[PDB]
């Protein structure tokens, strides 16, 4: 599925990650665009040989198992194929534990280079939420 900007606000903020560890909704959406371009269905390769699935870019080095990256852990807890359903549940449930992880939201690099530090309440501006 390829979200639409304020579905996904609507989403994210319906599934509690609104102000979540202090990150405000916006964050979120922004990590999302710039992740995902907002579809569920992306995967990355990494250089390390792990690949980032779905609408975050959760990691099968350390998140998610994919049967295909040595050495990794599965600290969600979940099959990184589950990260692609149309439903961000399992997404979200993860990401919230990511966040948790001691570096915030640096833990998404695309956040620190691109989100970080800019207006992203921008990302929500129009949403009814
Ligand atoms: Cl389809
Ligand atoms: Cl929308
Ligand atoms: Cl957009
Ligand atoms: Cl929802
Ligand atoms: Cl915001
Ligand atoms: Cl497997
Ligand atoms: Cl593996
Ligand atoms: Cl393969
Ligand atoms: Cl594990
Ligand atoms: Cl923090
Ligand atoms: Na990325
Ligand atoms: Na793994």
Same mark, same amino acid.
């Not at 691109?114 to 309440?121: A, E, L, S, Y």
């Given at each position: 599925k390829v979200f639409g900007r304020c579905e996904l606000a609507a989403a994210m903020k319906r599934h509690g990650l609104? !102000? @979540? /560890? #202090? @990150?405000? +909704?916006g964050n979120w959406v922004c990590a999302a665009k710039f992740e995902? !371009?907002? %579809?569920?269905?992306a995967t990355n390769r990494n250089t390390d040989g792990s690949t980032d699935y779905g609408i975050l870019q959760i %990691?099968?080095?350390?998140? *998610? %198992?994919? #049967?295909?990256?040595? #050495?990794? /852990?599965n600290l969600c807890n979940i099959? *990184?194929?589950? +990260? +692609?359903?149309?439903?961000?549940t399992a997404s979200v449930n993860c990401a919230k534990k990511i966040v948790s992880d001691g570096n915030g939201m640096n833990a998404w690099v695309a956040w620190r280079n691109? *989100?970080? #530090?800019?207006?992203?309440?921008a990302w929500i501006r129009g949403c009814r939420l």
């Open positions: 609104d !102000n @979540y /560890r #202090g @990150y405000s +909704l995902s !371009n907002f %579809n569920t269905q %990691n099968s080095r350390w998140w *998610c %198992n994919d #049967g295909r990256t040595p #050495g990794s /852990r099959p *990184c194929s589950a +990260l +692609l359903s149309s439903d961000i691109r *989100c970080k #530090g800019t207006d992203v309440q």
